[PDB]
Amino acid sequence: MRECISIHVGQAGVQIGNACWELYCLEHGIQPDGQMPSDKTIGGGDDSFNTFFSETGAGKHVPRAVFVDLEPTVIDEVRTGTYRQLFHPEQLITGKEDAANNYARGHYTIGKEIIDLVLDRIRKLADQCTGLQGFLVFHSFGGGTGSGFTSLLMERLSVDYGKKSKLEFSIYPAPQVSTAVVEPYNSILTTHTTLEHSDCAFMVDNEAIYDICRRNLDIERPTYTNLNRLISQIVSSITASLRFDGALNVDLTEFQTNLVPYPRIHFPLATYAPVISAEKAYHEQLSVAEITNACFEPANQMVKCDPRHGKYMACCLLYRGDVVPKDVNAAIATIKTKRSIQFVDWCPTGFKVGINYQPPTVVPGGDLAKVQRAVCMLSNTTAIAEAWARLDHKFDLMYAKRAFVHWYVGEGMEEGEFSEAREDMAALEKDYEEVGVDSVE
Amino acid sequence: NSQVTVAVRVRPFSKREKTEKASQVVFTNGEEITVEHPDMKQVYSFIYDVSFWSFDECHPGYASQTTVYETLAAPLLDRAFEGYNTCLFAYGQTGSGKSYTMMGLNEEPGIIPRFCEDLFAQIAKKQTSEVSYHLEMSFFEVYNEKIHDLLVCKGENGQRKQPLRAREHPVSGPYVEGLSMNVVSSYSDIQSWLELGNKQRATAATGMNDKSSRSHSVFTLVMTQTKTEVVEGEEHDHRITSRINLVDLAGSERCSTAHSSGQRLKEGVSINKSLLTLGKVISALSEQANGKRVFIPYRESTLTWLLKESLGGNSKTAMIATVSPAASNIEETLSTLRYATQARLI
Amino acid sequence: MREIVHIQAGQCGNQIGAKFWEVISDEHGIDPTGSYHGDSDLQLERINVYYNEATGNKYVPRAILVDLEPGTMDSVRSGPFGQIFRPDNFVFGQSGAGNNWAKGHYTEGAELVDSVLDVVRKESESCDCLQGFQLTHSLGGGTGSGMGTLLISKIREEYPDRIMNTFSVMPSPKVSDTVVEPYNATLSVHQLVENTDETYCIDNEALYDICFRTLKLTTPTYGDLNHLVSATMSGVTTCLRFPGQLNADLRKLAVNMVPFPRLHFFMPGFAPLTSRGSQQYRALTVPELTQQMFDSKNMMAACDPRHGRYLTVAAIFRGRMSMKEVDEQMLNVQNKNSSYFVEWIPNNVKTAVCDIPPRGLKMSATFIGNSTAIQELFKRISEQFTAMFRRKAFLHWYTGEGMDEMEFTEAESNMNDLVSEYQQYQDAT
């Protein structure tokens, strides 16, 4: 059946994972102990759908996910928290030492000694599946585990399973904000290895979500929880067509056919427009014409790039709730009338649509309002080429002086792995310039 | 004030691979060396100070051992008699042509023989009784940032690799404490000593080859020149010394692919760290050539620290990169070329 | 299970450690008998980093106390928290160093290092994993300077892939406390520039100034000065033994803060320090700590970063706080004060957050900085050194214990060759 395996890698992936599983349990009615009271309420009904959880005879619902870190700190809070009786206790920790912001320690040195145990549970998870779709990988660029461990895992999964969707949900690096001096290296080296092996890579930046939580929700002291709780809704919109019913279903194997023209240009963005507080939930109609326009304005992107400096190639639009299709056709007509939103000449259509009837669920203790309708937008632009240059320009400076390279060489790397990885990203800058060129014949 | 000279050499196809039908990957338009493979949309170019095309005998730019010497190593003996020091590095990977361009063969001799013979046979035309010449010779290795003498015989007991210490003399410069320095009269003595040394040099088996070098080997020649000039009395009133270092380096050894564990990995990391320091020092000498106040990181690796007085100041430094033209060896050749580029980025 | 082995050599190191354990035991709840009498459950989950189990739920630390004379050792045992030390770890001897590096490195320390390596080997093989070591000592005598450096040289050979921190107490510019600080400090920098990964330069004039015009104390004794160092030590190792939203071990900071392997001398700092009367006139917020942690009147280095430039900085926060505040403030520092930061490093700040703060506060912070201004400490010593070495003043007390003049020039040059490595990154072009 329609099945997906989630893999949470490093601190960001695991914390975002926590957020995601607190949201998956409430939509379906699973208590944190893994039980369902609906088993007593109505007999013979699927609410804890088999796409995200496996069932037992005792009426438990155990999630199809694997968390891995290299340090026991972040995953020791799942064993000592509310959701301790939900996950299979084989939550992979390689405690010993983490990657400490080094790609090499997460690839070979400390990255090994735990990957075989990771793929064994990934086999036990897939063998339980009656025909699976793909894998959801949640990690961050910049950290030593989120980059290295993921790049190693992605390459093995490319041999074992092969023709399966490998979708990534990654935290891309901000241009100004940062929490490390080695995010450029750990990004450029992850790209060189997770580009021939990924199928689609959804990007989010922390700076883009801070400005939303300030402007849209009136929060001037936001934390990582108020940040992960939007990332939960974005994954829920993607994963709703497998769980809940709707008119136009959109499975996971459709994205990579919709949003990836070429096999190297598969770096789309994300945005979730109706980010509203309870006070501004009123004074608002919250119609499709407002939301869809809100998904195309730069002040509501979850990545800090101005799409008016580029051209859209493709755009998926996944609606949730009370939504009639005509209200989508008219909205897309309006968006196509405008001259700011500019498309390539080789894609007049440039719109995939999906609709699902189940509206979102409001988490208790949240900053999001209850909504009759919600929308996501997974777009592919050339404006990303103006971010990959920045991360490259930083790479151009430090590597000129060979700073923070002793630490990589010291854990099984070469000087030539940087030049080979930096030359692969200078080609991905030329491709995004080719796709934007006017065609002729 | 100091001039670095990078030269890059391409070997011809092996007999083992001229029949196996390997696909040529490196080309040249005379000046620049280009790397191309049909699979790739991209082709990388590399311009060096000197390219020694040794692929096809019928080329108008063929480079035999008589050319790699006359173009690179011969201007280093012309400078040693002026009283200044010289360094000559040999970089490559296993199968590139390093030991063939450096030492050579029974009847096709590399740089060491054509240099020593052109030394001893060039002082015997200026060896008066007024001017004299004395030659001494040392030969050591760096293994995991630890100096070892190779011309010392082992015994009948456990580990016989005795580590020595590198000290800093205030006037002259750094030196190894306890190193056997031997006196030489001909080329045959150097040949015997080197043949005695390269059997003690560290070697391990890896996927690349049966015998891969795991140490930076350093061969030194100290030349003294005593002149007698009249100062109204007895005349011994002159001696200027010159140092000639010829060094065979190890390879990078991508530890990602070769799934290394233990001492090899350890060794690998050591060699990778020394090559990173050496590269930086070589690229800091080139900035001075143009002109800029800059600081050389000599005391970051032992090899660049022992050769401080042969790398900077009024000193000449040469570097021979070797690369294979086969398509099986394309990540190694590219790393070699990228490493040679940063040396000379003038 | 990351584990730290804590050596403490000499009077300075031993007193600082005796105050540090008084501080960490308060953080985990251990009493002077070794018994846990806490309230929370997060105090015991990661207590292995500094303690080992015993029979009756008693916790014995990994202290390796070292001294060449028994006077300082006797004081620790005859003290408040002295019954929490394994007596087989008080490794000491007679025949002290005499404020002489030679006696502690060649004559009277070589005959005792083989007994300290026994306790190191016994406290390290009884540990599942090991993030590294950390030493507290002084570069002004012979025991902390000599018998400490040798231990580092002999631990790197055994454990090279592990961390060697060193909370060193460097000499002060204006007023000395020993007359042979220059020699004993240069000959330790010669052995702390090749063998260590994090060195934290502390100076006592800065701590006097903190006690005076930041804390308003008119009788600052040494316990009050070590109360400051114990706070920094606690802060570097908070994200190993407590949880957080952004965690930072030792190697994580060493990989951010050390661009080139030799420049690992940092200038520490702690916030907030509020002086018991301005406690009710201050806000407990992130900017009020960020303004105190970047001010030159709070660092412990006696070196003004305004005469230099930051190459990297770190900020270990402790408390329930917002990450946007940290990111925004650490961006504002670089934007407003770009001249005090390097251009070829885009972001010079590393951030870390822990959720469980120090028992009496709602928020705390800890600061590490790599500045070129550190050269002012060394450039002075080499000015003293060559003034005393030109005349060979106090040298026969060093040559009479088995040393040569060549071992001095060696140490004189490296330090200078370090200043040029810092002055390389001082001016903008």
Ligand SMILES: CC(=O)O[C@H]1C(=O)[C@@]2(C)[C@H]([C@H](OC(=O)c3ccccc3)[C@]3(O)C[C@H](OC(=O)[C@H](O)[C@@H](NC(=O)c4ccccc4)c4ccccc4)C(C)=C1C3(C)C)[C@]1(OC(C)=O)CO[C@@H]1C[C@@H]2O
């Ligand atoms: C009302 C109140 O908040 O009391 C505070 C207090 O008023 C001030 C003055 C305290 C006080 O600090 C000092 O008096 C002091 C004097 C010299 C050197 C160092 C400290 C305090 O004594 C110190 C004490 O700090 C702690 O208790 C921490 O746990 C501290 N450890 C210890 O003090 C300690 C020492 C020995 C044995 C057991 C515990 C700590 C700090 C950093 C990292 C780990 C632990 C605290 C909150 C206070 C008093 C008591 C007044 C401050 O100290 C610290 C490090 O927090 C100085 O500024 C802070 C906060 C306050 O301003």
Ligand SMILES: Nc1nc2c(ncn2[C@@H]2O[C@H](COP(=O)(O)OP(=O)(O)OP(=O)(O)O)[C@@H](O)[C@H]2O)c(=O)[nH]1
């Ligand atoms: N949105 C979000 N971002 C996070 C979170 N935790 C960390 N990050 C970001 O991820 C990057 C750092 O990556 P980590 O996840 O800490 O790294 P790691 O994969 O654990 O790797 P090492 O700790 O280096 O071994 C920075 O950009 C952080 O801001 C989180 O909970 N939410």
Ligand SMILES: Nc1ncnc2c1ncn2[C@@H]1O[C@H](COP(=O)(O)OP(=O)(O)NP(=O)(O)O)[C@@H](O)[C@H]1O
């Ligand atoms: N210009 C050339 N002309 C002819 N043969 C060449 C040339 N350059 C290299 N060769 C061949 O290259 C071979 C070198 O192989 P080999 O002796 O294994 O070197 P190597 O030991 O593997 N390199 P290294 O281990 O780093 O010293 C010789 O046998 C030569 O026949």
Ligand SMILES: Nc1nc2c(ncn2[C@@H]2O[C@H](COP(=O)(O)OP(=O)(O)O)[C@@H](O)[C@H]2O)c(=O)[nH]1
């Ligand atoms: N901060 C602090 N410094 C100290 C203490 N005791 C000594 N010192 C410093 O240590 C230096 C003298 O070193 P010393 O401890 O005597 O070396 P040792 O005799 O070999 O152990 C002087 O610069 C003192 O300022 C102390 O309790 N606290």
Ligand SMILES: [Mg+2]
């Ligand atoms: Mg982590």
